[PDB]
Design a protein around this motif. Sequence first.
Motif, PDB file in Angstrom:
ATOM      1  N   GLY A 120      44.946 -56.546  29.728  1.00  0.00           N
ATOM      2  CA  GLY A 120      43.428 -56.823  29.869  1.00  0.00           C
ATOM      3  C   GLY A 120      43.054 -56.639  31.237  1.00  0.00           C
ATOM      4  O   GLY A 120      41.914 -56.588  31.606  1.00  0.00           O
ATOM      5  N   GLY A 121      44.096 -56.399  32.237  1.00  0.00           N
ATOM      6  CA  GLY A 121      43.687 -56.413  33.596  1.00  0.00           C
ATOM      7  C   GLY A 121      43.672 -55.087  34.135  1.00  0.00           C
ATOM      8  O   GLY A 121      43.521 -54.061  33.601  1.00  0.00           O
ATOM      9  N   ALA A 122      44.563 -54.732  35.192  1.00  0.00           N
ATOM     10  CA  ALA A 122      44.802 -53.403  36.205  1.00  0.00           C
ATOM     11  C   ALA A 122      46.087 -53.598  36.933  1.00  0.00           C
ATOM     12  O   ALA A 122      46.382 -54.514  37.360  1.00  0.00           O
ATOM     13  N   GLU A 123      46.621 -52.234  36.934  1.00  0.00           N
ATOM     14  CA  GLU A 123      47.847 -51.947  37.794  1.00  0.00           C
ATOM     15  C   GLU A 123      47.099 -50.822  38.852  1.00  0.00           C
ATOM     16  O   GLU A 123      46.942 -49.694  38.350  1.00  0.00           O
ATOM     17  N   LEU A 124      47.133 -51.287  40.133  1.00  0.00           N
ATOM     18  CA  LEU A 124      46.672 -50.100  41.155  1.00  0.00           C
ATOM     19  C   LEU A 124      48.009 -49.879  42.103  1.00  0.00           C
ATOM     20  O   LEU A 124      48.384 -50.651  42.709  1.00  0.00           O
ATOM     21  N   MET A 125      48.228 -48.487  41.961  1.00  0.00           N
ATOM     22  CA  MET A 125      49.319 -47.912  42.889  1.00  0.00           C
ATOM     23  C   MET A 125      49.204 -47.346  43.839  1.00  0.00           C
ATOM     24  O   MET A 125      47.756 -46.493  43.702  1.00  0.00           O
ATOM     25  N   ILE A 126      49.500 -47.206  44.892  1.00  0.00           N
ATOM     26  CA  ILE A 126      49.489 -46.479  46.008  1.00  0.00           C
ATOM     27  C   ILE A 126      50.751 -45.545  46.471  1.00  0.00           C
ATOM     28  O   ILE A 126      51.729 -46.180  46.857  1.00  0.00           O
ATOM     29  N   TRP A 127      50.710 -44.307  46.140  1.00  0.00           N
ATOM     30  CA  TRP A 127      52.054 -43.275  46.188  1.00  0.00           C
ATOM     31  C   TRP A 127      51.884 -42.876  47.869  1.00  0.00           C
ATOM     32  O   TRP A 127      50.986 -42.062  48.032  1.00  0.00           O
ATOM     33  N   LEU A 128      52.763 -43.167  48.423  1.00  0.00           N
ATOM     34  CA  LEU A 128      53.064 -42.767  49.857  1.00  0.00           C
ATOM     35  C   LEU A 128      54.050 -41.506  50.021  1.00  0.00           C
ATOM     36  O   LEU A 128      53.744 -40.724  51.091  1.00  0.00           O
ATOM     37  N   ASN A 129      55.195 -41.421  49.219  1.00  0.00           N
ATOM     38  CA  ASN A 129      56.045 -40.800  49.242  1.00  0.00           C
ATOM     39  C   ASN A 129      56.649 -40.258  47.867  1.00  0.00           C
ATOM     40  O   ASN A 129      56.494 -41.277  46.789  1.00  0.00           O
ATOM     41  N   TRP A 130      57.451 -39.273  47.738  1.00  0.00           N
ATOM     42  CA  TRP A 130      57.867 -39.048  46.431  1.00  0.00           C
ATOM     43  C   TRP A 130      58.948 -37.873  46.549  1.00  0.00           C
ATOM     44  O   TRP A 130      58.981 -37.059  47.767  1.00  0.00           O
ATOM     45  N   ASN A 131      59.606 -37.445  45.401  1.00  0.00           N
ATOM     46  CA  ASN A 131      60.494 -36.448  45.380  1.00  0.00           C
ATOM     47  C   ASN A 131      60.909 -35.860  44.110  1.00  0.00           C
ATOM     48  O   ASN A 131      60.844 -37.095  43.368  1.00  0.00           O
ATOM     49  N   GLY A 132      61.321 -34.879  43.834  1.00  0.00           N
ATOM     50  CA  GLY A 132      61.881 -34.463  42.455  1.00  0.00           C
ATOM     51  C   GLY A 132      60.608 -34.010  41.548  1.00  0.00           C
ATOM     52  O   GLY A 132      60.916 -33.888  40.165  1.00  0.00           O
ATOM     53  N   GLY A 133      59.445 -33.521  41.990  1.00  0.00           N
ATOM     54  CA  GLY A 133      58.499 -33.366  40.949  1.00  0.00           C
ATOM     55  C   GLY A 133      57.824 -34.297  40.299  1.00  0.00           C
ATOM     56  O   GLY A 133      57.066 -34.139  39.198  1.00  0.00           O
ATOM     57  N   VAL A 134      57.781 -35.693  40.452  1.00  0.00           N
ATOM     58  CA  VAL A 134      57.360 -36.940  39.841  1.00  0.00           C
ATOM     59  C   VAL A 134      55.829 -37.070  39.645  1.00  0.00           C
ATOM     60  O   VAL A 134      55.517 -36.325  41.004  1.00  0.00           O
ATOM     61  N   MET A 135      55.168 -37.294  38.850  1.00  0.00           N
ATOM     62  CA  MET A 135      53.637 -37.337  39.044  1.00  0.00           C
ATOM     63  C   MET A 135      53.436 -38.812  38.405  1.00  0.00           C
ATOM     64  O   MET A 135      54.023 -39.254  37.554  1.00  0.00           O
ATOM     65  N   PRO A 136      52.110 -39.012  38.801  1.00  0.00           N
ATOM     66  CA  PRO A 136      51.405 -40.635  38.385  1.00  0.00           C
ATOM     67  C   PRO A 136      51.073 -40.299  36.729  1.00  0.00           C
ATOM     68  O   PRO A 136      50.999 -39.258  36.157  1.00  0.00           O
ATOM     69  N   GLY A 137      50.870 -41.416  36.122  1.00  0.00           N
ATOM     70  CA  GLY A 137      50.436 -41.546  34.862  1.00  0.00           C
ATOM     71  C   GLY A 137      48.926 -41.101  34.668  1.00  0.00           C
ATOM     72  O   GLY A 137      48.399 -40.997  35.565  1.00  0.00           O
ATOM     73  N   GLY A 138      48.498 -40.923  33.261  1.00  0.00           N
ATOM     74  CA  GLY A 138      47.055 -40.481  33.103  1.00  0.00           C
ATOM     75  C   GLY A 138      46.703 -38.941  33.765  1.00  0.00           C
ATOM     76  O   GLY A 138      47.619 -38.124  33.771  1.00  0.00           O
ATOM     77  N   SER A 139      45.471 -38.974  34.046  1.00  0.00           N
ATOM     78  CA  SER A 139      44.927 -37.814  34.648  1.00  0.00           C
ATOM     79  C   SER A 139      44.348 -37.910  35.856  1.00  0.00           C
ATOM     80  O   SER A 139      43.836 -39.130  36.281  1.00  0.00           O
ATOM     81  N   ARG A 140      44.208 -36.883  36.774  1.00  0.00           N
ATOM     82  CA  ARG A 140      43.472 -36.771  38.139  1.00  0.00           C
ATOM     83  C   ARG A 140      42.168 -37.074  37.915  1.00  0.00           C
ATOM     84  O   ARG A 140      41.510 -35.685  37.142  1.00  0.00           O
ATOM     85  N   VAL A 141      41.274 -37.905  38.298  1.00  0.00           N
ATOM     86  CA  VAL A 141      40.039 -38.134  38.017  1.00  0.00           C
ATOM     87  C   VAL A 141      39.008 -37.725  39.242  1.00  0.00           C
ATOM     88  O   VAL A 141      37.666 -37.347  39.199  1.00  0.00           O
TER      89      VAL A 141
END
Length: 226
Positions: A120-141
Motif C-alpha cells: 500500500g506504499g511505494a518503492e522509489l528506485m534511482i538507477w545510476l548504472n547497469w549492464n546486460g540489457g536489464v530494464m526497470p519494471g512497468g512502463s516508461r511514462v
Amino acid sequence: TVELCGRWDARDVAGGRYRVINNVWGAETAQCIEVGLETGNFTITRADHDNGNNVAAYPAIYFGCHWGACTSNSGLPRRVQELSDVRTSWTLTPITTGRWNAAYDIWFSPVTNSGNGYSGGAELMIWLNWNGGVMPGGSRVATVELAGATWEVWYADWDWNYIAYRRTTPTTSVSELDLKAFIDDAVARGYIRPEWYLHAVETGFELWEGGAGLRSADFSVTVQKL
C-alpha cells in the motif's frame, strides 16, 4: 574487513549509522561481499547468480528501517510532508560483464511499522548504472530533468507503487544528490502521498546474473526535518 556469505547476513557499520546486507532474496545461488566496517564500503567477491529474468539478490547498504530492522538514530520513519532536505552520496565501481544495475531503493508506506513490508506504499528506485540489457519494471511514462540530470520515469502498479528513475546516461558517482527532488516529482504524479512515511534509503546492486567485482563506496545519507 569481513566477508559475509550467508543468505541474510548483515553488519552494522559506521558506528551503527548504516547497515550492509548480503540480501540474496530471490535465489539460492552463492554470494559473498567483503565489507569495510568503518565505512560500509563493500565489494561483491562472489556471485554465482544466473537467475534469468528475475532478480536474484540486492546486496546493499541502508539508512533507516528495512523490514523492521532499523539503523541507529536515523530519525526515520518520518512523513514526507515533514522533510525539508534529503541528501545522499555514493561511488560505485562498475564491471563489464553480467546483468545487474547500481540503484537506490527507497521505501515509503502509510504506516510506521515496516516489519511486514510496505504494501500500500511505494518503492522509489534511482538507477545510476547497469549492464546486460536489464530494464526497470512497468512502463516508461515520462522523461524529466531533475537534480542536475535527465531521467526516464518508469511506473508499475503492484502491491505498492513502483517508481524507477533511470538516468539517460550512466554515471559512477553522486555527491549530495537531492533525493527530495525525486520525492517531490513522485508526489506531483500521485505516486506517493505527502502523509506517507519515508522508511529507508538504500543503495546497492540488483543482480540477475553474475556481479563479482562490483564495489559500493562513500555511502552517506542525511535527512533534515521542517
